[PDB]
Amino acid sequence: VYKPVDLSKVTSKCGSLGNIHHKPGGGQVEVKSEKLDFKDRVQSKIGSLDNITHVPGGGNKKIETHKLT
Amino acid sequence: VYKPVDLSKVTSKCGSLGNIHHKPGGGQVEVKSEKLDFKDRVQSKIGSLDNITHVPGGGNKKIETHKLT
Amino acid sequence: VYKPVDLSKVTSKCGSLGNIHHKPGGGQVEVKSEKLDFKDRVQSKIGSLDNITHVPGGGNKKIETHKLT
Amino acid sequence: VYKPVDLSKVTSKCGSLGNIHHKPGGGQVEVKSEKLDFKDRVQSKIGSLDNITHVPGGGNKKIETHKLT
Amino acid sequence: VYKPVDLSKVTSKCGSLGNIHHKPGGGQVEVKSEKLDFKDRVQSKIGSLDNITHVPGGGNKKIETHKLT
Amino acid sequence: VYKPVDLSKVTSKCGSLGNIHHKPGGGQVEVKSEKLDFKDRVQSKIGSLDNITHVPGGGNKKIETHKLT
């Protein structure tokens, strides 16, 4: 017989959340290339890529796992 | 016999959520290329790509997992 | 017979959460290349990439796991 | 025979230009006058006058002069 | 025979330019005048006048002069 | 025969330029005048006048002069 119990609280209060500024790549990015030789695959990313601003009002997280085997 | 119990709470309160500024790539991205040779596949990304602004009121998460075997 | 019990609280309070400035790559990034030879795969990232601003009001976490085998 | 040659550059790059605050005359101006006597022209300026905020992207200058005599 | 040659550069890079605060005359100006006598021209300036905020991204200068005489 | 040649560079790089605060005349100015007599021209300046905040990204200068006489 298997009867685990959770009554827990995962809680957050905030008076205000804000004035959050994320300014990636506000300057110069400058790439110069001459007489290059590539015999195999090239993957290139230049500039302001994949940046994240994540401002959840709570962002609280529960992870729970159970296994019988 | 398997009878797990959860009565837990995952909760948040925010009085106000805002003034969130995400400004990726506000400057110069400059890319000069001369006499390059590519014998295989090329993938190129230039500028402001795949940036995310994610501002969920709440944004709380529950992950729960069960297996019987 | 398996019957764990949890009554826990994971909790926070913030009066205000803000004036958060993340400014990666506000300067120069400069990359000059001449007469390079590449016999195998090339991966290149130049500029302001993959930066994160993560401002969860709270952001509290519970991890729980149970196994019988 | 006069054949000067100019191939010069005057150049600038700025990634981002901003958060400029000019607040002239934010305090208190009080001017009391009694029994003044003026026999000739009067010019009077009182308060916040002729203040300048000048924010050119660029603002570069070339002056060039040529003379035969 | 007059054939000067100029191939010069005058150049600037700035990644970011900002948070500039000019606050002239934030205090108190009080001017009391009694029984003054002026037989000739009067010029009067009272308060916050002719103040400048000048923020050129660049602001580079070339001055050039050529003369035959 | 006059054939000077110029290949010069005048150059600057700055990553970021900022947090500049100019606060002239934040205190108290009081000017009390009684029974003054002026037989000729009067110029008067009272308060916060002609103050400059000058923030050129760059601000580089070349002066050049050429003369035959």
**Cβ pair A55:B52 closer than 8 A:** no
Give, as one character, the DSSP assignment of residue D32. Answer: E
The CA R_g of chain A, rounded to the nearest whole Å, is 24
The phi and psi torsions of C25 (rounded to 5 degrees) equal 70, 35
C-beta of residue E46 within 8 angstroms of C-beta of residue D31:
yes
Q: How far apart are CA A39 and CA B37, in angstroms?
A: 8
> What tokens appear for F53 in the block?
């905040």
Query: C-chain residues within 8 Å CB-CB of A68?
Result: 68-69
Touching chains, F (3+ CB pairs < 8 A): C, D, E
**Cβ pair F53:D22 closer than 8 A:** yes
Touching chains, D (3+ CB pairs < 8 A): A, B, E, F
Q: How far apart are CA D51 and CA D24, in angstroms?
A: 7
Resolution expressed in Å:
1.9
Give, as one character, the DSSP assignment of residue C25. Answer: T
**Cβ pair B59:C58 closer than 8 A:** no
Q: How far apart are the first and last CA of chain F?
A: 13
Query: F-chain residues within 8 Å CB-CB of C28?
Result: 13, 15
C-beta of residue F14 within 8 angstroms of C-beta of residue E57:
no
C-beta of residue A54 within 8 angstroms of C-beta of residue C54:
yes
Say which experimental method was used: cryo-EM
Q: How far apart are CA E43 and CA D41, in angstroms?
A: 9
Q: How far apart are CA B23 and CA A27, in angstroms?
A: 12
Interchain touch E–D (≥3 Cβ pairs closer than 8 Å): yes
Q: How far apart are CA E32 and CA E44, in angstroms?
A: 13
> What tokens appear for E37 in the block?
């006598």
Residue of C nearest to F15 (CA): C27
Interchain touch F–B (≥3 Cβ pairs closer than 8 Å): no
Please name every residue paired with C11 in a beta bridge, in sequence order, or none if there are none.
A11
Interchain touch C–F (≥3 Cβ pairs closer than 8 Å): yes
**Cβ pair B12:A66 closer than 8 A:** no
**Cβ pair F57:D12 closer than 8 A:** yes
Taking every pair of Cα atoms in chain F, the longest distance, rounded to a whole number of angstroms, is 71
**Cβ pair C28:E16 closer than 8 A:** no
Query: Rounded to whole angstroms, what are the CA distances from B14 to A51, C62, F22, F66?
Result: 25, 20, 38, 70
Q: For C58, which of B12, B24, B25 is closest by C-beta distance?
A: B12
**Chain C interface residues (partner F, CB cutoff 8 A):** 26-28
Q: Looking at CA atoms only, how far is residue C49 from chain E in angstroms?
A: 17
Q: Looking at CA atoms only, how far is residue C13 from chain B in angstroms?
A: 10
C-beta of residue B19 within 8 angstroms of C-beta of residue A18:
yes
Query: E-chain residues within 8 Å CB-CB of D7?
Result: 5-7
Q: How far apart are CA C24 and CA B26, in angstroms?
A: 12
Residue the block writes with tokens 């709470």: B9
Residue of B nearest to A28 (CA): B28
Query: A-chain residues within 8 Å CB-CB of B8?
Result: 6-10, 62
DSSP string of F18-44, one letter each residue = EEEEE-TT-S-EEEEEES-EESS-EEE
Residue whose C-alpha is closest to residue D62's, from F4, E65, F58: E65
Distance of CA C2 to the CA centre of its chain: 37
Strands F37-38 and E42-49: unpaired
Distance of CA D63 to the CA centre of its chain: 18
